[PDB]
Structure formats: structure tokens, C-alpha cells
Amino acid sequence: YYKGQTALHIAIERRNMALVTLLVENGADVQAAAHGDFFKKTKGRPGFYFGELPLSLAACTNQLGIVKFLLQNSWQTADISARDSVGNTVLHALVEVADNTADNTKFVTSMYNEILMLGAKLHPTLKLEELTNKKGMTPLALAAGTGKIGVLAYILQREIQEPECRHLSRKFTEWAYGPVHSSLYDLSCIDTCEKNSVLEVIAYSSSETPNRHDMLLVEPLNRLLQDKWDRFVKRIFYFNFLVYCLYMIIFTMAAYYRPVDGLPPFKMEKTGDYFRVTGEILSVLGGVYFFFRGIQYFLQRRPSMKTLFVDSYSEMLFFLQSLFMLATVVLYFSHLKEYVASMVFSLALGWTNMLYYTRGFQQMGIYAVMIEKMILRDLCRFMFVYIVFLFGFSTAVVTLIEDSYNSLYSTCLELFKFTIGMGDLEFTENYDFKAVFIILLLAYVILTYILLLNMLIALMGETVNKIAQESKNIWKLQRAITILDTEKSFLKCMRKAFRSGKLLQVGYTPDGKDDYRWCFRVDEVNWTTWN
Amino acid sequence: TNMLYYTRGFQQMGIYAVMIEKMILRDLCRFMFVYIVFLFGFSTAVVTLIEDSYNSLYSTCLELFKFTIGMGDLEFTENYDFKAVFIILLLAYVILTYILLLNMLIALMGETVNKIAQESKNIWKLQRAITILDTEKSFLKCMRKAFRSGKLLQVGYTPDGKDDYRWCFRVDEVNWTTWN
Amino acid sequence: YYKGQTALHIAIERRNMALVTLLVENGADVQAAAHGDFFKKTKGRPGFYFGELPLSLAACTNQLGIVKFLLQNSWQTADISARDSVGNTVLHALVEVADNTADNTKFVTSMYNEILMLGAKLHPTLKLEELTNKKGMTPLALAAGTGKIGVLAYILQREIQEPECRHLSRKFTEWAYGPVHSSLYDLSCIDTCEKNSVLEVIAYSSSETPNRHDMLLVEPLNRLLQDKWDRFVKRIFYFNFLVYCLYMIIFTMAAYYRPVDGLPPFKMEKTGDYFRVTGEILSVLGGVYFFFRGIQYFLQRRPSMKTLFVDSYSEMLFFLQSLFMLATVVLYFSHLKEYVASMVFSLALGWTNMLYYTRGFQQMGIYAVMIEKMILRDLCRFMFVYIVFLFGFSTAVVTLIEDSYNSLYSTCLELFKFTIGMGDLEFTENYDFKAVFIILLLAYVILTYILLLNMLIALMGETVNKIAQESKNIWKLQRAITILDTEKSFLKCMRKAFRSGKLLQVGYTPDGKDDYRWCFRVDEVNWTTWN
Numbered sequence A, C: 001y002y003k004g005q006t007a008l009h010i011a012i013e014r015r016n017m018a019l020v021t022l023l024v025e026n027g028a029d030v031q032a033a034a035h036g037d038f039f040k041k042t043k044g045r046p047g048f049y050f051g052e053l054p055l056s057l058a059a060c061t062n063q064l065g066i067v068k069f070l071l072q073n074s075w076q077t078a079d080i081s082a083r084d085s086v087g088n089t090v091l092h093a094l095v096e097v098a099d100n101t102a103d104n105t106k107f108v109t110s111m112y113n114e115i116l117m118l119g120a121k122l123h124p125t126l127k128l129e130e131l132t133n134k135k136g137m138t139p140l141a142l143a144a145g146t147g148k149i150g151v152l153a154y155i156l157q158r159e160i161q162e163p164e165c166r167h168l169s170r171k172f173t174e175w176a177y178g179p180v181h182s183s184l185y186d187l188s189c190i191d192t193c194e195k196n197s198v199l200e201v202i203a204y205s206s207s208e209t210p211n212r213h214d215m216l217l218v219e220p221l222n223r224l225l226q227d228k229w230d231r232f233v234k235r236i237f238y239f240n241f242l243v244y245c246l247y248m249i250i251f252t253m254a255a256y257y258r259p260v261d262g263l264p265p266f267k268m269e270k271t272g273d274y275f276r277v278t279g280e281i282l283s284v285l286g287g288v289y290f291f292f293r294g295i296q297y298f299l300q301r302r303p304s305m306k307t308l309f310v311d312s313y314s315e316m317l318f319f320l321q322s323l324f325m326l327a328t329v330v331l332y333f334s335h336l337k338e339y340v341a342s343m344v345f346s347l348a349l350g351w352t353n354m355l356y357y358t359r360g361f362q363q364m365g366i367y368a369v370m371i372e373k374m375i376l377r378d379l380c381r382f383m384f385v386y387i388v389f390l391f392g393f394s395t396a397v398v399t400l401i402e403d404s405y406n407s408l409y410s411t412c413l414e415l416f417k418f419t420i421g422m423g424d425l426e427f428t429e430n431y432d433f434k435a436v437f438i439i440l441l442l443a444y445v446i447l448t449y450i451l452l453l454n455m456l457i458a459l460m461g462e463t464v465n466k467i468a469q470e471s472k473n474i475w476k477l478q479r480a481i482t483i484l485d486t487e488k489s490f491l492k493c494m495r496k497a498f499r500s501g502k503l504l505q506v507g508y509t510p511d512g513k514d515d516y517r518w519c520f521r522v523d524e525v526n527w528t529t530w531n
Numbered sequence B: 001t002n003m004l005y006y007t008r009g010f011q012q013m014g015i016y017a018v019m020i021e022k023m024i025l026r027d028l029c030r031f032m033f034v035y036i037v038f039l040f041g042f043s044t045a046v047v048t049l050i051e052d053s054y055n056s057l058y059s060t061c062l063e064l065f066k067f068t069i070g071m072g073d074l075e076f077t078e079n080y081d082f083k084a085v086f087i088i089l090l091l092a093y094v095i096l097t098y099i100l101l102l103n104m105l106i107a108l109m110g111e112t113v114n115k116i117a118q119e120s121k122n123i124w125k126l127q128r129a130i131t132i133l134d135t136e137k138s139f140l141k142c143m144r145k146a147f148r149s150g151k152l153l154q155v156g157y158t159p160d161g162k163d164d165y166r167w168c169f170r171v172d173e174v175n176w177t178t179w180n
């Protein structure tokens, strides 16, 4: 429970540096692993994780005075790159304690900064931020993989002004001319990390992770993706859009001109059949593609059963579109006419999945984001209550009918017409009590047509005033995933033409070598930083 | 419809016509795009299922457009093999287009109206400005003497000492804190 | 232009009291009337009205130092009750310069206060606020009749704490017990002024006058009207509501059971005819009442031709209802069957004019206020543009028709059905160019049904977020007019049972007599005025 604890750990938490220096000098080890249940990840349990190391506690506890003392104390100094059972160094652990509150975020960045210089002063050659925990994550990847907007916003924009501690800084100013100054961000382990690039950790993450849609608004990420978009992804996406439009044009005609006389599989007799079956072949191939391309997705992005509809609503429909295509082949060689049933759901999904390609366009893609939110939020709530009413009042109605609408389908079908403006208040005379039939339909109409549909309009308006920004940021994330799924798939061998940035020598290795870094230029202006 | 041009001589009507032309270009074009994708998506589906007369992409698209103007028959064909498909598909069309998307547009418009309200007053004044300028050019176009806003008002002196005559526009104003 | 000006007037405006004392002592009159064009009411002209008297200028110019000097200067003192050609004293003129800005309102109240005490110190017996100008208005009535919310809010709540200057104060505290304190407002010339009570000047005013709907929120007015409402007006209004409901029940049945065989005037043959003509008599009498009761209104409230729809939308409909009734009598004895046309508009107006009586109920009356605003604002704008479209596309359509809808009525009638959800896209086949007919109707539908109706919903929502408070305050003013039209009409001889307040001796005449004042009690609590 407390397994691994020391009285040194006590003193750091009880605000007692007078006794930390007392315990270390008498030989209290400063590598001790508090590998006890209370000291692990909370996960609901009443705990505090800090890093399973004394130095880690002081960093997560805001005594920078203590922290420095642990590292130049003459009796014994903590190993700066010492990690825990999870593999988390102090900087790793210093991320996992972040919670994206300003009082926390101001501190963690203030502290995270200071262990770096200290480790640089102690060890100009050791690289701390490159260290990886047990899982395979860095402090940068951990911040992005865990939702830590302020830490990430710090690490990327890390401009340090010190003689020996600029090789750690990441946001470099190359030149300046009056109010104009031209910054430089680093892109090391952001676009092409061998393991867990920041982009590939923000985008291939789960909606449980907070602030997925806010992290890409951190500079340079936004500018970086719009650079990949403008350079090579936009052309490929428009091309992917064209092929899918030609696909659906072809699957549409091969469907429209389906044989009607016989049972499948049908015969190549005239020339139009040959030029149609072609389209039918090409129709299936896309389904196989979207099938494999969906299996791929739902393996390498092991989907949380709830996250399917939030993060992956479109992928679900392309996959579902594929399934109806494959069922359409199983049933076309199984001689069953029911291939058409499947085939028509593929078309309808197929054409609606054009809205996928809205994400190459801001105002249309934001609109399609609002659509998928309204579906999952406002419409599902609506249709639930609507069907309770529909089924409630239908049963009532069809129980009153005597004799033909003496069926729960037709009555439910007639009562659904009221909500699409096609309700007859006289669709039956076959009953005994007109007062009942009318009171009941009016109650249905008032509750459903006058109230509930118009309430939905009102609910939607509330939603639109709320998800307006959320939907812009879900849009940019949709486009980000396209940029990443693209640059993988398209290149997948060379990975040299999408190199955002360039070799820009920014400074020097603290030993003295040159500091070459792939860096992203950003041009900026100020009118109050006059110095 | 180009009568709505002449709304710009009237503030509350001209602002309304500005909102109209914004909704057309912003909210309606986005809508009708997505609407036609759905309309054409579900029509093809429907007319592919039809066997026999609505066995035409016009008439099916024409019948499915009626749902959105409140004139949809869920029984406009019996000429098919699979009623479950025909109904699931039209209901999906109706739910997506009539229940969701039209009512979403109302909701989008309301968001727009809360935003372009000031923008539209200022686009209105600019519309009227262009009328004032296109007018005073065209009407006079020879004399250009009756529209002289302001008057010769001697305001001061040339720094050499001559008089400073300037066409000037008078504005009357009040203050209750500039007591000096 | 400057007719009547003096060099004394110069010095007050040029910030020069050193020379005001110079001019008066040499004999410069301090009664001089600046009865010149620049010194009269602006009314668009570039002027400054101040009161046509020197003392009046200094009060409207913010030199209280000067003002006091004018009245104890030994050479000659301004007459405090000296008025101008308009009849406005300094206090009158001090109202007309108010503009309901805080910097102005803070001052005018600060100054208005001080001439009163000064006039009280000079003249404990003269009554300044009772003085009336040429028109017949007091400084209190002028503030209400002219829209001066802060002045009025000052005068009514005027609590002064001085030994000799409480007989001027109006808001008296009678008792106090800890945090509880029980105030007392005066009601002199507020509910029963012989001339221009504040209520009868706020309510019988024109919408041009700003802040009609805000003035009644000034205490004690709001509490005072809710006291008349709860005491005697609510019962009478519900009674007036009952009689009108019995009226319309009777005019409804006499209309429903109208003779159908013959020409009017019809014959009393059976008994139901006698018991019907009765209702027809009683029907007309209400019309005469609402006719005279409307003539009355539109004489003693000489209506601005634009103000008809804003302040008097309902009165217009009751009057119009009356006219259709009287035309129904002119045409029933003129033997013409067209009495029915008139009669049915009376009914439809008659029943819709139930919404009048919503103003006895807050949430319904506010709703009826929103209705009449939407009609005049949102619907009229809509229907204008709608009819341009309707008529634009109809002419287009009927010009294309060849042959029967070859009529501008029927086409306009068919195209109006699209907007009520009853449009047929196939109402004609009688034409030559189907592409044109369809493109044109779709353009009509898209512009009118999809855009413009739904835009109206959106416009209404904007309006509702705006007029929500405005409509509550227009409601209270509607009810106020009912309270005033009631207490006049009902009593109209005795005027003794509606006496809001009671004789409460508050203090003393500065000579020494008792100070009896009709006063309105208000109970209040504080938790920071601990003294």
C-alpha cells in the first residue's frame, strides 16, 4: 500500500527541507522506488502518482529549492535520467500530474523548464526529452497522448534565452527587422518521429483523451498541416474525391441498368452488358478496398465501443457500405434477387459518403461535422421520444379501429405522415368512437408536430450556438487525419517529398558541433515588442 | 425579384434584403449541396429498386423532393419487390432531409442572423452609398453644382496669411462632461 | 436671433463669475428674457434652450456657485418663481434640458435638488414644483410627458434629510426596526392630479416620447398600479372580459343561425327568430359601444398616423370590428346579402380581440405583445418580399401556361400552396417547356419555402431575444391604461373608493401646520444599511 516508502519521502511532502538534508547526509538513499499501491496511478483509487522517485516528488510538489538541492548535494545526487517501474522519468511523471488548470499549467511548465537546464548544466550531453518510458512514449508524446495542452504548448514554443541553454530551446528566431520577426519551430519528433509523432498521437488517439481538437491549434501544428495540405495533400484529396465520384457514377449506372428479367448471375449477351458488368466489377473492387481499408482502421485504431460514433462515424459508413457490397456479391452468385436490397443501401450510403470529402473544405466540412453531431445528439434523443409517441398513439388508435388500417404498420405509417405534413385526420371511419379517435390524434399531433418537431428546431439552435467552435476544431482534426493517412499511404517507401521544413542550422551542440534541425518557418509581426 | 434592389432606400427592408442575399450564398448553398447529395443518393437507390411509372430518376427525384415541401407520399410506388427496403430507405431520406436537415437549416439561419445583424446594417449603408454616388454622377454629369454638400465656410487662414475657404459639413453636437 | 440677450448671459456661459458680479452690481438686470430664436427650443435648429432667464442658464450650465450668488446678491436677486414666455420656471427649463444620460442625469437631479432648498430657505411658503408653465404642465408632469426617467425617478424618490427641508421630500420613512424599514411615497399629483397626473401623462402619451415603458418601472408607480389592480380593477376587468365573451357567444350564434332563404331584413316567424334577433340587437349594441368607445379614444388621444399600429393596434381592431358591424346594419336594411361579408370580419376580429384581455395576465399579455410586434416587424417585412416573389414567379408561370390555371389568381393561389405545404409541382401540364416550369417553381420553392419561411423563423428568434423585456414593459403599460381607463369610467362621479394610500401625517408645514399627504406604503429590507 505504501510499499517502498522512506522517511525522505515524508519530508518532501511535509514541507521539510531541513530534514531532507538531514536524512540524505546520514545516508538516506535518493533513488528509492515508492512502488506501492497508493503511489501508482490513481485510476479512481485515492492516490497520488508523482514518479516513484524522491526527485520526482519534489518536482511535482513545487519546491524547486528542494529539487536543486537533491542534485548538487555532496553526499549523493539523484540520477537525473533515473526512471521508475513505469519507465517514467521526472519529466514523464511531471506530465502525468498535469491537469490543464492554469495554476497547474503555469507550474508544470515553470518546473519542467528548470530540470532541463539543470540536467543540461550537470549533463550538457545527456538528452532528457528523448527518453522513453516502458510503453515507448516520450514526455512530448505523453503530453499529446494524454491531453496536456499547456505542457505541449510549452514544449513546442520553448524559446530559452541563455548562453548554454539554447540547444534545448525549440522555437528559434532566425532574423528580425523592426516589427517583423521570423521565428523557427523545430519539427523533431512531431511529423516524422520514428515512434509516436505528435501528429500521430493527437490524431490516432481516443476521444477519451481530452483536448484532441484543441491540441492541433497549438502552433506550429496548425500552420504545419495547412502546409502539407497546400503542398501535396490537397491535390491528392481532390483526386481521391474524383475517383470516388467516378466510382459512384459507375456503381450508380450499373445499378440503374441492372437486369430485371431472370435470376442472377446474369448473362453477357449484348455489348451494353459487357460495358455494364465492367462497372459491376469496378463497383465491387471499391467495396473490397473500403472493406480492407476499414478492417485496417478498426485494427490499428482498436475502437472503443462508444467512440465508434463520435470519432469514426464516417469510417463506419464506408465500411458498412462495403458490407452491403459484399453481401451483394454473395447474393448475386447465390442466385437471390436480394442483392438489390443490399446494393441500394450501398448507393445511398455511397452518395452520402460524399460528405466525407467536405473535409477538404472548411465551411462545408464544418457543416458536415454539425450534421453528424445533430444526428447523434439531437435527432437520436428526438426519434426515441418520437417513436414512443408514435407507437404509443398508434396502438391506441389501432385498438380502437374495427373492421383497412386495422394494422399497427399502417396506423404507424399514417401517423408518421402527420409529421411530414401529410396527415389525414379522417384516414379511418372504421371505429365506434369518433371523439376518441380525434382527441387521440390531436393529442398525437399537438405533442409530436406542434411541440416536438418545433422543439427539435429549438434544440438544434441551442446546439449550433454551442458546437460552432467545437465543429471547426473537429474539422481541422478530420483534415489532419487525412493529411496523415495520406502521407503514409502515398509515399510509404521514400518519405522525402513531404518534408515540411528544411535543414536549418540553428545553433550548436553544447560540445561545439553544429545544430542542424528540421524546422518550420513562421513569419510574424509585433507592434509592442519594440526592442 | 429585383424589386428587392429598391429596398436599399429603406433601412429595415434593405437590411432584410441583405440578410436574404447572405442566407442564399452562405446557408442555402451549403444546404442545397448536401440536400442534393441526399436527394440524388436516395433517389438512385429508390429507382434502382423500382421494377415495372416512377422508373425514372426524374420522377423519383421529383417525388422525393415533395417530402421536403410537405407533399411526400410514402406509397408513390407499389412497383418493386422489397417493401422493407423502399420504406427504410424513404424514412432514412425523410429523417435525414426533412426532420434533420431542413430544421438544421432553420437553426443555422438563426445563428447567422445573430451574427450578420450588424454586418447587414453596414452592408446596407454601403449599398445606399453606391446609389448616392451612381446617382450624383449620372443625374448631374455636366453641372455638378446642386449636390454640393456643405458650403463655403472660411475657417481660418493660409499660414502665409490668405483666407482659408473650405467646403465644409456642419455637425451639431452636445456634451455634458467637456464643461470647459 | 439673439433677441433679448445681455452681456450678463455672456459671462455665465463663458465661465466668468468675476464679471457676473461686475455686471449685476452696476445694475445689469437679472430678469432679462433671452426671447430670441437661438434661445428657443432646438427642434432641429442649432440652438440651446435654457429657460430664457439668467438664473435658468446657470442652473442648466453647472455653476451652482453662480446660481446661489444670483439669489443673495445684495444689489438685486432673481425672482425664484420667475417664468419665461413658455411659462417655464428654472425647474421646468431644468427638465427640458435633461437628456437621460448619466452625466446629465446625475447633474440635473443634483441641481434640481438645490434650487428647491434655496427657494425653501428664501421662501418656505412658496411652492415651486406646483408651478405650471403656459401649457399647463408642472416640472413633474413635464418630466413624465417628455420622457425624463432620471428626473422623474428623482422627484418621486426624493428623500431629503435636513431640519427645515423635509416638507419638500417625498419618499418618507415612517418607521424602522432593525433591517426592516417601511418607506412612504407621496401620491400628490401622481394618481389624482386635477391636471396631468403622472400616470395620465405616461399613459396618454405618444410613443415618440422616449421611455414610456420604462417610466412605470419607477417606484412607486409599479407598486401603485398593482395595488389598483389587486383592489378593484382586476375584478372589473374579468367582468369586462366575461361580458365580451358573452357578447361574442351571442354574436356568434346569431351569425351561425342567420337566415339563409330570402333577402334581409328577415321576418320574426318562429320563436327562435325572436330569441335570435335579440342576439342580433345585442350584437349591434356592442358595435355601437366599441364605435363610440373608439371615436372617444381617437379624439382625446389625437393619433399620430404612424403611432396607430404601435400604441393602438388593438383599439384599431375593436374600432374596425365596430365598423364591420355598422356596415352590417346598413346592408341588412338596404336588403343586401353583403351584410354577411361584413359580419364575418367582425366575428373574426371579435374573437381575436379576446387577446386584448390577455393584458390582465402577465405571461399571456407579454405573449400578445410579442404577437403584435412580430406582425408589424417580422411578418410585414416577410409578406412584402414574399408577395414580390409570389407575384414575380406567378406571372412568369402564367405567361408560360397555354390552353385551367391560365389565370394569375389560380397560379398565385397554387404557388401560395407551396408555402403552406400543399404545393403540386404538376398542377399544370398545359405549357410547352417543362424545364422552364420546373426550374421556375423550384426557384420559387427554394427562395420562398426553404429560405424565406425558415429565415422568418430565424428572424423571429432574433426578435424574441430582443423584445422580451420590451414586451414585459409594454405589457405593464397596457395594464396601466386599463387601470386608468377603468378608474375614470367606473367611478366618474365619486372617485373615492380607488384612493390608493391614506391620509398619513408625515411632518409639518415649515410655518408649523401639519403635513397631511396621501401616501403609499412600501415595506423594504436591507442587510448593509445597518445604521
Ligand SMILES: CCCCCCCC/C=C/CCCCCCCC(=O)O[C@@H](COC(=O)CCCCCCCCCCCCCCC)COP(=O)([O-])OCC[N+](C)(C)C
Residues within 6 Å of the ligand: A246, A249, A250, A253, A254, A256, A257, A258, A259, A271, A272, A273, A275, A276, A278, A279, A280
Ligand atoms: C460517366 C463517367 C463514368 C465512367 C464512364 C462510363 C461511361 C458511360 C457508358 C458506358 C457504356 C455504355 C454502353 C454502350 C453500348 C450499349 C448501349 C445500350 O444498349 O445502352 C442501354 C443500356 O446500357 C447499359 O446498360 C450500359 C451500362 C452502363 C454502366 C455504366 C458504365 C460502367 C463503367 C464501365 C464502362 C466503360 C467506362 C470505363 C472508363 C471510365 C441504354 O438503356 P436502354 O437502351 O433503355 O436499356 C434498357 C434500360 N433499363 C435496363 C434501365 C430498363
Ligand SMILES: CCCCCCCC/C=C/CCCCCCCC(=O)O[C@@H](COC(=O)CCCCCCCCCCCCCCC)COP(=O)([O-])OCC[N+](C)(C)C
Residues within 6 Å of the ligand: A238, A241, A242, A245, A354, A355, A357, A358, A360, A361, A362, A363, A364, A365, B037
Ligand atoms: C472533382 C470531382 C467532382 C466535381 C466537383 C463537385 C464538388 C466541388 C469540388 C470539389 C473538389 C475540387 C474543388 C477545388 C476548388 C475549390 C472549390 C470551391 O468552390 O470551394 C469553395 C466552396 O466549397 C466547395 O465547392 C466544396 C464543395 C464540395 C465538397 C465535397 C462534398 C461532396 C461532393 C459531392 C459532389 C457530387 C459528386 C458527383 C458528381 C461528380 C470554398 O470552399 P470552403 O468551404 O470555403 O473551403 C475552403 C476552400 N479551399 C479548401 C479551396 C481553400
Ligand SMILES: CCCCCCCC/C=C/CCCCCCCC(=O)O[C@@H](COC(=O)CCCCCCCCCCCCCCC)COP(=O)([O-])OCC[N+](C)(C)C
Residues within 6 Å of the ligand: B003, B004, B006, B007, B009, B010, B011, B012, B013, B014, C388
Ligand atoms: C412608388 C412605386 C410603387 C408603389 C410603392 C410600393 C412600395 C412602397 C413605397 C416605395 C417608395 C416610396 C415610399 C416613400 C415613403 C415611405 C414608405 C414607407 O412606408 O416606408 C416605411 C416602410 O418601408 C417601406 O414602405 C419600403 C418598402 C418598399 C421598398 C421597395 C421594395 C420592393 C418594391 C416592390 C413593390 C411592388 C411594385 C409593383 C406595384 C407598383 C419605412 O421604411 P424603413 O424600412 O423604416 O426605412 C426608413 C424609411 N425612410 C427611408 C423613409 C426614412
Ligand SMILES: CCCCCCCC/C=C/CCCCCCCC(=O)O[C@@H](COC(=O)CCCCCCCCCCCCCCC)COP(=O)([O-])OCC[N+](C)(C)C
Residues within 6 Å of the ligand: C246, C249, C250, C253, C254, C256, C257, C258, C259, C271, C272, C273, C275, C276, C278, C279, C280
Ligand atoms: C349561451 C350564452 C349566451 C347567452 C344565452 C343564450 C342562450 C342560447 C339560446 C338562446 C335561444 C334559443 C332558442 C330556443 C327556441 C327555438 C329553438 C330552435 O328552433 O332552435 C334552432 C335555431 O335557434 C336559433 O336560431 C336561436 C337563436 C340563437 C341565438 C343565440 C341567442 C341570442 C341571445 C338572446 C337570447 C336570450 C338570452 C339572453 C340572456 C343572456 C336550432 O337550430 P335548427 O333547429 O337546426 O335551425 C336551423 C339551423 N340553421 C339556421 C343553422 C340552418
Ligand SMILES: CCCCCCCC/C=C/CCCCCCCC(=O)O[C@@H](COC(=O)CCCCCCCCCCCCCCC)COP(=O)([O-])OCC[N+](C)(C)C
Residues within 6 Å of the ligand: C238, C241, C242, C245, C354, C355, C357, C358, C360, C361, C362, C363, C364, C365
Ligand atoms: C371569464 C370568462 C370566460 C372564461 C375564462 C376563459 C379564460 C381564462 C380566464 C380568464 C379570466 C378569469 C381568470 C382569473 C383566475 C386566474 C386564471 C389563470 O389560470 O391564470 C393563469 C393563466 O392565465 C390565464 O388563465 C389567462 C388566460 C386568459 C386571458 C384572456 C385571453 C383571451 C380569452 C379567450 C377565452 C375564450 C372566451 C370564450 C368562451 C367563454 C395565470 O396567468 P398569468 O399569465 O401567469 O398572469 C398572472 C396571473 N394573475 C393575473 C391572476 C395574477
Ligand SMILES: CCCCCCCC/C=C\CCCCCCCC(=O)O[C@@H](COC(=O)CCCCCCCCCCCCCCC)COP(=O)([O-])OCC[N+](C)(C)C
Residues within 6 Å of the ligand: A239, A240, A241, A243, A244, A246, A247, A248, A250, A281, A282, A285, A286, A287, A289, A290, A293, A294, A314, A315, A318, A319, A356
Ligand atoms: C477499363 C477499366 C477501367 C475503367 C476506369 C477505372 C476508374 C474507375 C473509377 C472508380 C473506381 C476505381 C477503383 C476502385 C476504387 C474505389 C474508390 C476509392 O476507394 O477511392 C479512394 C480514392 O483513393 C484511391 O486510391 C482510389 C484508387 C486510385 C486509382 C484510380 C482508379 C483506377 C483503379 C482501378 C482499376 C481499373 C481497372 C479495372 C478494374 C476492374 C477513396 O479515398 P480514401 O482515401 O480511401 O477515403 C475514403 C474511404 N475512407 C475514408 C474510409 C478511407
Ligand SMILES: CCCCCCCC/C=C\CCCCCCCC(=O)O[C@@H](COC(=O)CCCCCCCCCCCCCCC)COP(=O)([O-])OCC[N+](C)(C)C
Residues within 6 Å of the ligand: A384, A387, A388, A389, A390, A391, A406, A407, A408, A409, A412
Ligand atoms: C419505429 C416504429 C414503431 C415501433 C416499432 C417496433 C415495435 C415492433 C412491432 C411489433 C411487434 C414485433 C414483431 C413481432 C412479430 C409480429 C407481430 C406484430 O407485428 O404485431 C402483432 C400485434 O402486436 C401488437 O399489437 C403489439 C406488438 C407491439 C408491442 C411490443 C413492444 C414493442 C417495443 C418497441 C416499440 C417502440 C417503443 C417506443 C420507442 C422506444 C400482430 O399484428 P399484425 O401482424 O399487424 O396483425 C394483422 C392481422 N391481419 C393479418 C388480419 C391483418
Ligand SMILES: CCCCCCCC/C=C\CCCCCCCC(=O)O[C@@H](COC(=O)CCCCCCCCCCCCCCC)COP(=O)([O-])OCC[N+](C)(C)C
Residues within 6 Å of the ligand: A434, A435, A436, A438, A439, A440, A442, A443, A446, A447
Ligand atoms: C398537452 C397534451 C396534449 C393535448 C391533449 C388534448 C388534445 C385534445 C384536442 C382536442 C379536443 C377538442 C376537440 C374535439 C375533440 C373531439 C370530441 C368530439 O366528439 O367532437 C365532435 C365535435 O363536436 C362539436 O360540437 C364541435 C366542436 C369541436 C371543434 C373541433 C376541434 C378542432 C381541432 C383543434 C382543437 C384543439 C383543442 C385542444 C387544445 C388542448 C366530433 O364529432 P362530430 O360527430 O363531428 O360532432 C359534431 C358534428 N357536427 C357539428 C357536424 C354535428
Ligand SMILES: CCCCCCCC/C=C\CCCCCCCC(=O)O[C@@H](COC(=O)CCCCCCCCCCCCCCC)COP(=O)([O-])OCC[N+](C)(C)C
Residues within 6 Å of the ligand: A249, A252, A253, A256, B033, B036, B037, B038, B039, B040, B055, B056, B057, B058, B061
Ligand atoms: C439536382 C437534382 C439531382 C441531381 C441532378 C444531376 C444529375 C444528372 C442526372 C442524370 C445524368 C445526366 C444526364 C445525362 C444524359 C441522360 C441520362 C439520364 O438522365 O439518366 C440515365 C440513367 O442514369 C443513371 O441512372 C445514372 C445517372 C446519374 C449519375 C451521374 C452523376 C450525376 C452527378 C450529379 C448528381 C448530384 C450529386 C449530388 C450533389 C453534389 C438514363 O435514364 P432515363 O433517361 O431516365 O431512363 C428512362 C428510361 N425510359 C425511357 C424507359 C423511361
Ligand SMILES: CCCCCCCC/C=C\CCCCCCCC(=O)O[C@@H](COC(=O)CCCCCCCCCCCCCCC)COP(=O)([O-])OCC[N+](C)(C)C
Residues within 6 Å of the ligand: A375, A383, A387, A407, A408, A409, A410, A412, A413, A416, B083, B084, B085, B087, B088, B089, B091, B092, B095, B096
Ligand atoms: C440516422 C440515420 C437515418 C435513419 C436510418 C434508419 C431509418 C429506418 C426507419 C425505420 C425502420 C423501422 C420501420 C419499419 C421499416 C420497414 C420494414 C418492414 O418490412 O416493415 C413492415 C412493417 O412490419 C411491422 O411489423 C410493423 C412495425 C413497424 C412500424 C412502421 C414504422 C413507422 C414509421 C416511423 C418509424 C421510425 C423508426 C426509425 C428510427 C431510427 C412493412 O411491411 P408490411 O408488409 O406493411 O408489414 C406488416 C404489414 N401488416 C401489419 C399489415 C401485416
Ligand SMILES: CCCCCCCC/C=C\CCCCCCCC(=O)O[C@@H](COC(=O)CCCCCCCCCCCCCCC)COP(=O)([O-])OCC[N+](C)(C)C
Residues within 6 Å of the ligand: C239, C240, C241, C243, C244, C246, C247, C248, C250, C281, C282, C285, C286, C287, C289, C290, C293, C294, C314, C315, C318, C319, C356
Ligand atoms: C334580455 C336581454 C339581455 C340579455 C343579456 C345581456 C348581456 C349580453 C352580453 C353581452 C353584450 C352586452 C351589451 C353590449 C356590450 C358589448 C361588450 C362590451 O363592450 O364589453 C365591454 C365590457 O364593459 C362593459 O361595460 C360592458 C357592459 C356592462 C353591462 C353588462 C351587459 C348588459 C348591458 C346590455 C343591455 C341588455 C338589455 C338588452 C340590450 C339589447 C368591453 O370592455 P372595454 O373596457 O370596453 O374594453 C374593450 C374595448 N376597448 C379596448 C376598445 C376599450
Ligand SMILES: CCCCCCCC/C=C\CCCCCCCC(=O)O[C@@H](COC(=O)CCCCCCCCCCCCCCC)COP(=O)([O-])OCC[N+](C)(C)C
Residues within 6 Å of the ligand: C384, C387, C388, C389, C390, C391, C406, C407, C408, C409, C412
Ligand atoms: C398578393 C397577391 C399577389 C399580388 C396581387 C396584386 C396584383 C394585382 C393583380 C392584377 C391587376 C389588378 C387588377 C386590375 C383589373 C383586372 C386585371 C387582372 O386581374 O389581370 C389582367 C392580367 O394582368 C396581368 O397579367 C398583369 C397584372 C398585374 C401587374 C400589375 C402590377 C401589380 C402590382 C402589385 C403586385 C404585387 C407586387 C409585389 C409586392 C410588393 C387580366 O387577367 P385575368 O382577368 O385573370 O384574365 C383571365 C382571362 N379569362 C377570362 C379568359 C380567364
Ligand code: NA
Residues within 6 Å of the ligand: A420, A421, A422, B069, B070, B071, C420, C421, C422
Ligand atoms: Na407541410
Ligand code: NA
Residues within 6 Å of the ligand: A420, A421, A422, B069, B070, B071, C420, C421, C422
Ligand atoms: Na403538407
